[PDB]
């Protein structure tokens, strides 16, 4: 892009796509912070079977991914890429975007996340048998939350998470690069304008999102090997398309 008016138009445009595609409004999440699972409800979750809690989490991830697909569809540049590259970007990026969007549903004051209507701590997911992954996700959401990420910042940051020209498989790499650099300009322009450039050094390192995504795939492979009929019969088709 040439001149601040085109960059600023991009900023507004990205922010609007984000707002139209967030599953939960931020104030609905904040208004729920006192609604916290009782210890008896926590115990109830801990006693659910591994396979039932996997199914539930997969369903919830699938719904979050659907909103990310709509997000990508509303970024003009994205829908200008060829279909192969759209799919490449979405298969590598969708989970990373959801992982970023989850910080909004995380309360750093008590280390809880909004899940199935109330806030609960990481002990809520014990039945999954993936304590390392869960703990890493909570840690990631705590990092971002410490930054006090604004809605506008999440918009712009998650547009960049998705439009990543380093994804293996991209055919029009140069085109993705150009889009990535315009979105980087937009993000950094907005940071400069809002006096928020101090967060650049505090953003999680390159590789942290990859690490969560790869742990997620690794834990999935173990679960699937234990309960292959559950995955086939009861995991959402989109989930399996992205991760199995």
């Amino acid at each position: 892009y040439a001149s601040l008016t085109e960059i600023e138009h991009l900023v507004q445009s990205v922010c609007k796509s984000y707002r139209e595609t967030c599953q939960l409004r931020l104030e609905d999440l904040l208004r729920q912070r006192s609604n916290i699972f009782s210890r008896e409800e926590v115990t109830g979750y801990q006693r659910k079977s591994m396979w039932e809690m996997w199914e539930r989490c997969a369903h919830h991830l699938t719904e979050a991914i659907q909103y990310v697909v709509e997000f990508a569809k509303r970024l003009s540049g994205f829908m200008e890429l060829c279909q192969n590259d759209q799919i490449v970007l979405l298969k590598a990026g969708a989970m990373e975007v959801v992982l970023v969007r989850m910080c909004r549903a995380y309360n750093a004051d008590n280390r809880t996340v909004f899940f199935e209507g109330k806030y609960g701590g990481m002990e809520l997911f014990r039945a999954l048998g993936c304590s390392e992954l869960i703990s890493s996700i909570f840690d990631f959401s705590h990092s971002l939350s410490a930054l006090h990420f604004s809605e506008d910042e999440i918009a712009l940051y998650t547009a960049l998470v998705l439009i990543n020209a380093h994804r293996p498989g991209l055919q029009e790499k140069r085109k993705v690069e150009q889009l990535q650099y315009n979105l980087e300009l937009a993000f950094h322009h907005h940071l400069c304008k809002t006096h928020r450039q101090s967060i650049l050094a505090k953003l999680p390192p390159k590789g942290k999102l990859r690490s969560l995504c790869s742990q997620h795939v690794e834990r999935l492979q173990i679960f699937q090997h234990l309960h292959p009929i559950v995955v086939q019969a009861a995991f959402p088709p989109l989930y399996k398309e992205l991760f199995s």
């Binding site: 697909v69 799919i87 989109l238 398309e241």
Partner: peptide, 9 residues
């Protein structure tokens, strides 16, 4: 396949 349908609709 599901992605392709979500992107097309």
């Amino acid at each position: 396949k599901i992605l392709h349908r979500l992107l097309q609709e």
